[PDB]
Design a protein around this nucleic acid. Sequence first.
RNA 1: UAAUAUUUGUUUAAUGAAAAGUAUUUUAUUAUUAUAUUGUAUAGUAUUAUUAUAGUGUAUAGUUUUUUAAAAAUAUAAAAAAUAAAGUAUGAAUUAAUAUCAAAAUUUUAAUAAAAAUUAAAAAAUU
Lengths: 55, 116, 216, 111, 48, 168, 82, 52, 37, 65
Amino acid sequence: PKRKKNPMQLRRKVYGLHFKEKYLKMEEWYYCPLCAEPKKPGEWCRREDCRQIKP
Amino acid sequence: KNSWPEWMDNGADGTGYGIGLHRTHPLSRLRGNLKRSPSHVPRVLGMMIQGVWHKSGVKLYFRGGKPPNPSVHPYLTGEPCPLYGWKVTDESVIRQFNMPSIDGTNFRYKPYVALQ
Amino acid sequence: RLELLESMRHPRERDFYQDHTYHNQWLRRDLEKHQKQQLAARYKYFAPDFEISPWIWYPGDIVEVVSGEGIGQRGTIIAVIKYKNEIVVQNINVQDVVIPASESRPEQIVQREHPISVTRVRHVDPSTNEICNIEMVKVRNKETGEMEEKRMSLESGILMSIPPVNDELEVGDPLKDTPIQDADEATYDREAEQAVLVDKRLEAMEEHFVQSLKQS
Amino acid sequence: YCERLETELTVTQERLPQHTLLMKAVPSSWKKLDIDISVIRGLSLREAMAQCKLSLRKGHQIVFRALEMAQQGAEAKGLDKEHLRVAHISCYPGPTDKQIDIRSKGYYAWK
Amino acid sequence: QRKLPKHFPVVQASDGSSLLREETIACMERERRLPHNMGKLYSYHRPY
Amino acid sequence: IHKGWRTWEYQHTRPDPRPFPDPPVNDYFGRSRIWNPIACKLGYVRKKADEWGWPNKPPPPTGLRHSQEFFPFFFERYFPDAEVRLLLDSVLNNETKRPVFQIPCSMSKVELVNYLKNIYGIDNVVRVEVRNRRGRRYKNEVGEIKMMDDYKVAVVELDTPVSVELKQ
Amino acid sequence: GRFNMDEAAAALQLNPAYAAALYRPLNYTFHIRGQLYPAQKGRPSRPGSLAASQGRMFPLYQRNDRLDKELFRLNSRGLTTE
Amino acid sequence: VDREVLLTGKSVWECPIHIDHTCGGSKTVPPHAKKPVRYMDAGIANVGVTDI
Amino acid sequence: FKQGQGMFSHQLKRLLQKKSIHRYNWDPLPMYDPRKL
Amino acid sequence: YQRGGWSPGSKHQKHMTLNPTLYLYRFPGPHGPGPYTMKYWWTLGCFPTGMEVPFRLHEFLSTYQ
RNA sequence: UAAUAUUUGUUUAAUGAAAAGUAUUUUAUUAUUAUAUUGUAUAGUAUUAUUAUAGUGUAUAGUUUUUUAAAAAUAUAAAAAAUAAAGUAUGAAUUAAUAUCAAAAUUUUAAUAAAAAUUAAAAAAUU
Ligand SMILES: [Zn+2]
């Protein structure tokens, strides 16, 4: 760095899509019909119902 | 030279039996190497911090982590001889605790005095 | 809250020196200054001469509260805490005392009188019922030349006696205690034992003197 | 007059249908925690707890603890669990500890 | 007029004899080390 | 003194030496604490107040001072001072042949046996083992470092196993 | 029908307290310098807790001087020329 | 003692602890010490004055 | 050794500061011994 | 050398031969001392540097008294 | 600067250790053949540093804390091969007169001229 960056340069990084995708992003989920925990589709739990039929 | 006898500088035998600090009851004729004079002040500290490294591979006096007080050692009561490991040259320095008992009204006495 | 403080952090971050310390903690080095100030402000009675000179207030006296809360209230002195310069006055400055729970008991909220500073209370003249400035007087006690000290009200000239210090007489340990008729028996015959002592000092003094004569 | 002012301020803050939890000395930074907070503003308690539960970030874990405890507080206050919402989430700078980072040629700095 | 500064301790008998003053001092000192009265310590560094 | 300093502008007072001396008192209450061999005036003067009144009373003849009857020796012979105390956890409800004593560090193995023989009447003692343990150091709630007195741990080996029973 | 170091020492006449001392470091038996962990050192009693000493929490790692005097340092009566 | 007095209500006359105001420095002073007699001191206190 | 972080060298910087007993031993006269005159 | 304060809390680079300081592991900061040093306060009995004299009077009055 | 560098604990032949001058052993501990007395565990170099210095004495105690799902270029070894970069967590340092910035060209002005004037045509983020 050759100079102190003002609040605008600090604020410029949040307009970027990289920032938004990394930090402020909401996850999509449903309720596991076997466990009733919030769940992302494609990720399962160690429980013998959830291994064979993985809901 | 040294007032204190030479067996407490280097040992009475080869393994350095009798060396260290020795304190004397100051009613007793025999004398120790504990001297608080300025000129002696290095070597007493030299015993308390270092101790001494004997050529026999064993470190005499203080080898550890707890430095010994030369001041509260019990009094020097004798001198070492090779036959019987310690000769008692002076018995009068050992405290003989003696308590008078069952004399007069002494039995009725109790450690505390009562109230009125 | 400590365990959830450690349940919210990451396992990756180590913190060293858990049971030992780089610097030796057994040196006496002073506190940081504001807790020294806490100590001083909390502990004022450790100062020299904090006890007030010829102390007047003794339990049983009737006293007005001059300043602060409860101003203008007359009461009787219940207890004296002398080294703090504090007074407990009957049903003045009564607050709650919390007695915590334990194995057998619940938490109890119990009203109690709390110590008042001596600065803000003044005596009431037992005759005039006015605030009197009390001075401290010596008066020959009856049958006694000791002239023990009483407190006089300057306006009306009334002497107030000092009450006794009566205490727990409920403490005793008969088996282990010597009775008085036992303890007061005189065994000291002094001349005989004095002679013995003196002679055995004499012996040593002479002995060393003749040793001096020898080496001279 | 004054004690009455503070009385009515406390009672107008109290008889309001909300629960305000203040958690102090949270073990995260200001910037990171602000980042992790800004996701959750203006959400249901349901989606708040779910979005806190479903992320890999420290800030979200901390906010989950806060949500759970404030929820217990609000239920102890007599509100309804199913209608709760995060009305206000904010972070402000707290306390600090310092550390020695040792660097070559007799250089040091304070982490 | 004082014969010792106000902040000095009073170590002496009630008669004023200084005969025992070293015993009194020694006693006070061993007592400042470990007061006989002393209740439970709230410190994490505890003698046992 | 190629060039003389201006010394006329100073009033005469001794500056403090910049490598300032630390106070002679020993602040370390740990394990490694050293007894200071150096003797100040105060030691001898307090001796002199203790043994005879030095400020007021006239000194006794040397022959008395150097004799068994001289008061600190007299009082030590006829009024001994030792705290020989017992760790109860050694003698509590277990039978133990080896009770453990705390002892003032100036006692020998012989003096303990003499103590137990003539006072407590403990007549069977096979032998004594001796440790010197530095007194117990603790901090109180203000953080004042305090150190209880140094002691000597004596494991005392008997003939007959000894217990002290606790009624539950 | 396992190993059982005690009955292995009894079969070999190895003094079963010693045989075990072969399989722990020389720090834990003999008086010898060695790496010690400050959590083993022991702790004074807190208000919440009791005292913690290395007598109760580590009996088997403490030093034995039977073995130490019989193995390492010399006997005096072997050398006495008197 | 504060707690116990607050509960039991007993009056306490002498302080339950001894305070060495010299913080262990009075032992440094030699045992025979006494202040010298100072003559004609500066002060207004030896004139007992109640009203000024 | 007085230079170290150890506590022995910490004591020696402090303990060695106190002043020893002083008496004025005024010189002996070995060759003129007044007591034999 | 010395691009920051002469304090032992200050931000930037220091040097040992100019600004000598001893080794303070976790030095409680300018304001509040935080949850880390307090973690140490509630577990090992004092702050990790051993310079901060443990002073608990204020809780002795709270629990034991 | 800095959503940065660093750190990152999934498998041990560090066998040994007097020369360390710091580390609450609550009683670490003989049963001795010997006599009294004294003393045994981790802090060298500002660090729990690259990793110690040296004198013992010995050879089968495996004697038991190193993250990770592409490719360039850097570092080793044989442009192939081995290693490392989106990562969750920790979080420094050089630097900092600045306004949301200063892109391209032309001449001028007291010495590059990011100084002028004129024409002009520089979006945001990340590497
Ligand atoms: Zn499931």
